[PDB]
C-alpha cells in the first residue's frame, strides 16, 4: 500500500510504483547473479529487495526505520529469514562498495550502504565480477573447513565366523532386570 497516500500511511513514505518496481527488479537480478535465489525461498529475498529499494528511494526519512517497521506499515506479514537474507544482500553491497573508489574511500557500513544502492546497480556487472574473482555459500560451511568429507577407516572385516559371544550375554536381561521391568509398568 506504499503507492497510495492513504491516511494510514504518512505522505513521506509514498513512492512511485514504476520506480520502486524497477529498483526491486534490479535488486532481485543482483541477488540472482550473486547466488541468492538458489535453495532459499524467493519471497524473503523479494521482501529484502523491496525494503532496500524503499530505503534507497529516501534514506533521509527512511533509513531510521527497520524491516519490521516497513512490514507493519505495509500490512504484510514479514518473512522470518528475510532479515538474515537482507544482511547477506547488504554484505554483497559492501563487497561491491569496496570496488568503487569513492565508496571505498567513504568507508560505508551496513547502514550507510543503501543510499548508494542505485550507483551499485549502475555498474553491477563489473562489481559482481570483481567480487567473484576474489561465489556465495551458506555461512555454516564458510568457516574455513580444513577437513572436507573425512575418509572413514576401512573396517570391512568380519572375522572368521563370529568375533565374540559376550555381546549376547551383555544384551540379554537378567531375571532381576526382567522382574524390575515387569514391576515398573505393572
Give the footprint of other proteins on this chain (CB under 8 A).
7-11, 41, 43-44, 58-61, 63, 75-79, 101-103, 105-106, 115-116, 119, 123, 125-126, 176-177, 180-181, 184-185
Taking the complex as a whole, how short is the minimal distance between the CB of residue 159 and other proteins, in angstroms? Answer: 19
Report the residue number, 19 or 123, with the smaller CB distance to other proteins. 123
Ramachandran category for residue 146: left, alpha or beta (phi over 0 → left; psi -120 to 50 → alpha):
alpha
Burial of 29 (0-12, 13-18, 19+ CB in 10 A): middle
| Nearest-angstrom CA–CA distance, 8 and 174 | 74
Report the residue number, 87 or 126, with the smaller CB distance to other proteins. 126
Taking the complex as a whole, how short is the minimal distance between the CB of residue 184 and other proteins, in angstroms? Answer: 6
Tell me the residue ranges of DSSP E strands in 29-100. none
Taking the complex as a whole, how short is the minimal distance between the CB of residue 44 and other proteins, in angstroms? Answer: 8
| Nearest-angstrom CA–CA distance, 104 and 119 | 13
Taking the complex as a whole, how short is the minimal distance between the CB of residue 126 and other proteins, in angstroms? Answer: 7
What are 43's three cell numbers?
A: 519471497
Report the residue number, 19 or 161, with the smaller CB distance to other proteins. 19
Tell me the residue ranges of DSSP E strands in the chain. none
Query: Are 65 and 57 contacting, i.e. CB atoms less than 8 angstroms apart?
Result: no
Report the residue number, 105 or 161, with the smaller CB distance to other proteins. 105
Report the residue number, 149 or 160, with the smaller CB distance to other proteins. 149
Taking the complex as a whole, how short is the minimal distance between the CB of residue 116 and other proteins, in angstroms? Answer: 7
Amino acid at each position: 500500500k506504499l503507492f497510495q497516500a492513504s491516511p494510514s500511511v504518512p505522505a513521506k513514505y509514498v513512492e512511485d510504483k514504476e520506480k520502486m518496481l524497477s529498483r526491486t527488479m534490479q535488486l532481485v537480478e543482483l541477488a540472482n547473479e550473486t547466488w541468492l535465489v538458489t535453495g532459499r525461498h524467493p519471497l524473503p529475498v523479494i521482501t529484502a529487495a523491496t525494503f532496500l529499494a524503499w530505503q534507497s528511494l529516501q534514506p533521509a526519512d527512511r533509513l531510521s526505520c527497520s524491516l519490521a517497521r516497513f512490514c507493519k506499515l505495509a500490512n504484510v506479514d514479514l518473512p522470518y529469514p528475510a532479515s538474515s537474507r537482507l544482511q547477506e544482500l547488504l554484505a554483497v553491497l559492501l563487497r561491491m562498495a569496496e570496488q568503487l573508489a569513492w565508496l571505498r574511500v567513504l568507508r560505508l557500513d551496513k547502514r550507510s550502504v543503501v543510499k548508494h544502492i542505485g550507483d551499485l546497480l549502475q555498474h553491477r556487472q563489473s562489481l559482481v565480477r570483481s567480487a567473484f574473482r576474489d561465489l556465495l555459500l551458506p555461512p555454516c560451511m564458510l568457516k574455513s573447513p580444513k577437513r572436507i568429507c573425512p575418509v572413514p577407516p576401512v573396517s570391512t572385516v568380519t572375522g572368521d565366523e563370529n568375533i565374540s559371544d559376550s555381546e549376547i550375554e551383555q544384551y540379554l536381561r537378567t531375571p532381576q532386570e526382567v522382574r524390575d521391568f515387569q514391576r515398573a509398568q505393572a
